[model samples]
Structure formats: C-alpha cells, structure tokens
Target: KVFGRCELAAAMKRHGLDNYRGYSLGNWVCAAKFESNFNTQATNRNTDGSTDYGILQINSRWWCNDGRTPGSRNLCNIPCSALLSSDITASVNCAKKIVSDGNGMNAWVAWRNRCKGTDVQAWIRGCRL
Candidate 1:
C-alpha cells in the first residue's frame, strides 16, 4: 500500500507530476485512485494473460517484463518488479514516458473510464499542497 489521496498528491508533487507533460496532478491522482487505490504493490491479472503493476497498473504488454509474460515490449527498459516498490521514482518516470508518447492517461483504462473530461479537483482536495 501507499499514500491516500492527499498524501499521494503531495508526494507526486515532489515527484514532479505537477507539471509533467501537461497532465494535471489531479488527473494522475484520480487515475491512481481508480487504478490501485494508491497501492504501490498492487497487481492485476488481465484477461489476456498479462499483468498490471504498481500505482498506475502499468501493463506488461508494452512497459515491463515479468519473465513469465510473453511479448513484453519493455519500452521503459526496466523490470516490472521495479514498479511495485514504495519508491515511486521509477514508476513515475515510466508513467511519464508513457504519457509523453502521446498516450496521455488513456494508457490506463481507469483514467479513461473515470477521469476523462471529469472534474478531478476533488482528488487533491484538502491536501496541504
């Protein structure tokens, strides 16, 4: 597990998500809330037999390798396990690279379903930041 909404917002602010690639901190926080409930160790097995990892639920199909999953692109050039840690530097960097590739937050289904075109200011509401 990791931070709650406010805490995660503060941390992401420190991690530099506040101004990364035109994505709002609220957008990232809202996405993480739906993706993993802010849990860094979160993992999900997908129907296609691949898996998702970490706060963003990054997919094995294109971002990371788990040895068991076939056809991982490993575009981030890091192990999937690296994203599952409490230290979110690698995870944040990877996710930033992904968004930079023009995927926006659309790479995350959670964001597409929940945060797109929606008011997400509440995700950071009451945070000290």
Candidate 2:
C-alpha cells in the first residue's frame, strides 16, 4: 500500500477520487483495513475448510468464481485479490461500492457513529467525495 500510492492514485484517478471526505481519515482507512488490511494476501477462516481469500477477504467461492479453476474474482482483474494478486489499494475501489457510492468517509462516519463519532448521518445524505 505504502509502496504503490502512485498505482492506487492512478487507478483512483480513473474514478476521479482524490482528497478526503467529510474531514475524516477514518473513512479512508476503516473498511479497507477491516476488509483486507490493505494487504493482497489477507484471508479469513470460514470453518468449512474453505475460507474468504485475499486482502479484502473476498470469498473465493462466493465473490470470485468464473470457472477459472478455483473460481475466484482473482482480485487482480477486479480490484483486490488477497491470494490471487497484489492490489492492496485497488481493493478500496471495491470498498467504495460497499461504502455509500464509493464514499469511504460515509462508511467511516457510520462506523464512528456506531462507535460514537458524531451525528454524521444527516450530513452524508448529499455529500459526494
């Protein structure tokens, strides 16, 4: 992640993503950190011998499957592929989808609100990062 801000920024530029949203860095770091730790090899245990794979821990069987041998999003082709490839920052692109319209700050605001950041929900209604 720290090694490829350029790549991440270039990829992010494709979406015109720059600057922080709502004056908080938490949104910028929370989901991606929770999902993949910005690492492309992060994985999670599912207790069924199979598990969520890659940095975002995208379920190899669920989120990533296109008849490509093991069947996973491959993280490389999409955005973040924990075990499939190295797209640490790339995963944030997907995180944006998970986060409200790709608003990492909104996700963070919600998270912090869950943790008691502030009454930010009202502000998130129309803000676009």
Candidate 3:
C-alpha cells in the first residue's frame, strides 16, 4: 500500500518510531520518502546481490533472511518478506533492532543522504503529532 505522508507518519508513531533511538518521526518519515516513497511493497536488489525490502528498506544482507542473500545474519530473525506487508509492525521492529545495534539511522543510506543534517522537523510540520 502507498501511504500518504501524514498517514505514514501516524503509523510510524504508533509503532514507537516517534523518537526511537534519538531519531525523530521526521527522520524516519523522510527516509521512507526517499527510500520507498511510502510504498509498503517496495523492494530493491542491491549490486552486492542483496535485496532491500519494504518500507524501511531493511536489507537481506544483515537484517532479514530472504533465502537468497548469501551469508545473511538475519539479525531481526524475520523473513525479509515480512517487511513488505501492509502491516508495518515487523518493519518497524526490525528497524528498531537496526538502530539499537549501534548502527544508528546511518544504517540506511537514504537517511544519511537525505535526512541527515536537514531540517527533518519540516517533514512532519502541520501534522498533529
């Protein structure tokens, strides 16, 4: 499903992403915009033979198991397919794991390239938090 900006922000907040690991809702929201454009079913195959899945674009290389990525650690202990579900619980949980692992939000290239050092709060402005 493709979520509207405010709709995705509200959903991410409900999943405890508002300020998880010191990152604001806007950071996550901005990353999602650049990463998947709010599409829950988004997927991208990396040049390294790994695939990124779902809204947050969790990678098969280290986060989720896709049965195709070689030497996957499956740190989230979930199938990569789980990330693609319209129900974003698994995606949010796995993203939390990624952040808690000390990788910070930098784990996602989109976040680093698009959200970092920006006024991300503007991303959520006008939304009733």
Candidate 4:
C-alpha cells in the first residue's frame, strides 16, 4: 500500500517470506545493483547477443528452453519493471524469490555478506526495507 520498504514488506508477508525479509533486503538490492544497476527493464545478451530479456539478467535462452510451463514467458523472463509496476506483495515476493528463492535465510545473507565493506549505495541508490 505504501511504497518502498513497507510496501515491499507487506508483499513478503503475503508470500510467507516475511520472517527473513529484512535479513535479505540489503543484499538483494545489492545484487540488483550488480546485476542490472537497478534498471527495472534491463535485459542482457550473451556474447552472441541472443538472450534479450529479464530483470535479474536471466538469460531468455535458458528461461525459454529450460521451462515447460504453458506460459513460461511470465516466469522465464520476469521483468524488474513489471515487478515495480506490480503490487507490493508481488514485487517483494518476486525479489525474495530472485535473491533467496525461499531457501535458507543464509541465501539472502550470502548476498549481504558479499557486500561487506563495499559502497552499498553504489549498488542500491537508496534502499529501504
């Protein structure tokens, strides 16, 4: 309902991933910075310039090839911009899945750990939640 942290937090709770939300926020944001510089509509191409979609820089080639769902495109190439445009619950939950995949809290902590001593803001301009 709000924006940023609270909104994202609500989203996590909706997805049952709230307990570890705070623990992961900083790092997940950091990963976004490293991955796409927080560009919601970012897309990365391989050396051959084939893959051309995904917010987390997920390779469309793999996204389409590895998935067999009816409309795999939705999950295959989840756009950060889409998440941004979506509700708080959807946005944060997607972020949680992307960074932690509902795995152990350490999965998110692992990301935070990597950010140790680095200029965190360089990765995430003004992270909240």
Candidate 5:
C-alpha cells in the first residue's frame, strides 16, 4: 500500500491474509490500492457523517470510533487512531472479521469497482509471494 506492492504482499502474508476466509492476497492488495494507495494514515469522510480509516478504510460508523463521530458501534473495539498507524495487523484483522461476518470484500467500495473480475496476478505482478 504506502510501500511497494511486494511489501504489501509480504505484509498480507505476514498477517495470514494470503488465504484468509477465501479471500486472496491479490484481492486484499487491490482493494487497499484503490482505497488509500496503501496509506495507513488515510482518512476519508463518508456521506453518512462517519469517516473511513486506514488501509482497509474501516468506517467509523461501525468498525472504529474517532470520537468525532457519534453513535459509532466500534465493532472492532479499537480507536480510530489505532487504525491510522503503520502497523496494519489490526486493520487486516478487522477487515477479515468484517468479511467473515458476511459482507466479504463487498464491504469495500474499491473492491467492487476495481478488483472485481480483474486478474489477481496483475496485482501481485512482481511480488514473490
């Protein structure tokens, strides 16, 4: 994401994202690319008055609480600040849980628009993984 594609791949693998819950590393990387270009500090305000945070861009409406947004479910039980750090493990974990809860990668708008039906190999191109 903020790093090279190979680094992104390695991070995914490190987080056990290579084959977590039927989602491939390519899908995870591609979605992250579209969402924040892999920026851990990325924050986008949503139309619903909540904000999306981190690489996976988990929303404040449900996954994290920024304190600015009221009524956040904080489903991941993490502060929004935690999602903005370089350590992506929590973000990855939250994403997987969201997927496991039934949204799959459909929880990410980026996945629907760019990753869907695309060649996953292209996303991982030169990555050794």
Candidate 6:
C-alpha cells in the first residue's frame, strides 16, 4: 500500500515511532517520503549488492535476510519479503531495532540527506497526530 503523508505519519505514531530515539514523528514521516514514498512494496538494490526494502527501506545486508545478500546478519530475524507486507508491524519493529543498534535515524541515508538538519515538522504539520 502507498500511504498518504499524513496517513503514514499517523501509522508511525501508532507504532511508537514518535520521538523515538530522539527523532520526531515528522522526521520519520520525512524519511519515509524520501525512502520509499510510503510504498510498502518498494525495494532498491545498493551498489554493494545489498537490498533495501519497504517503506523505511530496511537493508538486507544487516537487517532482513533475503537469502541472497552475502553475510546477512538477519538482525531483524525476519525474511526480507516480510518487510514488503502492508501490515508494517515487522517493518516498524525492524526499524526500531536498526535505530537501537546505535545507528539512530542515520541508518537511512535518505533521512540524512533529506530529513536531517531541516524543518521536518513541515512533513507532518497538518497531521492530526
């Protein structure tokens, strides 16, 4: 499913991403917009041969196991296919794990490039959190 901006913001908040790891709900919203445009089935292959999956674009190299990425730690302990599900529970959980690993929101390059050091509040300004 491709979520609208406010819808994604509300969903993330429900999943406990608001102010998670010191990053605001707006930050998460902005990151998702840039990462996968809120598309649950989005996937991207990296130059290093790793794959990013789902809305938050969790990486196969260190997060989900796709049975293809070499040396996958499968830290999330779920198949990469799970990340593409519309449910988003696993994706959210895996994203939390990624942040808790000390990577913070910087784990997503799109966040660093587009959401970081900016007025991300604009991303969710009208959302009724």
Best by lDDT: 3
Off by over 4 Å in 5: none
Alpha carbon lDDT of residue 84, candidate 6? Answer: 95
Model 2 segments more than 4 A misplaced = 1-25, 48-50, 66-83, 99-129
As for lDDT, the candidate ahead, 2 or 3, is 3
What lDDT is reached at residue 65 by model 3?
Answer: 97
Q: Residue-wise lDDT of candidate 5 within 9-109, one digit each (tens)?
A: 88888889987888788999999999999888899997778999988889998888788887888888888888888989889878877888778889999
Query: Which residue pairs does candidate 4 place in steric collision?
Result: 11-89
TM-scores of all predicted structures: 0.94, 0.40, 0.97, 0.41, 0.93, 0.96
- Top TM-score hit: 3
Candidate 6 ranges with C-alpha deviation above 4 Å: none
Over 4 Å off, model 3: none
lDDT of 1 by residue, 16-70 (tens): 9996888789999999999998999999998887899999999888888887787
Local distance difference test, each candidate: 0.89, 0.43, 0.93, 0.42, 0.86, 0.92
How far residue 55's Cα lies from its native spot in candidate 3, in Å, is 0.7
Instruction: Give the per-residue lDDT of model 2 (tens digit) for 1-129.
Output: 332323433444454334434433333333334455555666676555445555445544434433433444443345223344664344544444444444344433324444235443332233332
Clashes of each: 0, 10, 0, 1, 2, 0
Q: Tell me, what's the RMSD of every candidate?
A: 1.1, 8.1, 0.8, 7.1, 1.4, 0.9
Candidate 4, 1-129: lDDT as tens digits: 123434433334455643354543444445444555544455554575344333234443323332322334444245433443434344444545544545443333434456645664443344343
Better of 2 and 5 by lDDT: 5
Candidate 1 — worst ten consecutive residues by lDDT sum?
64-73
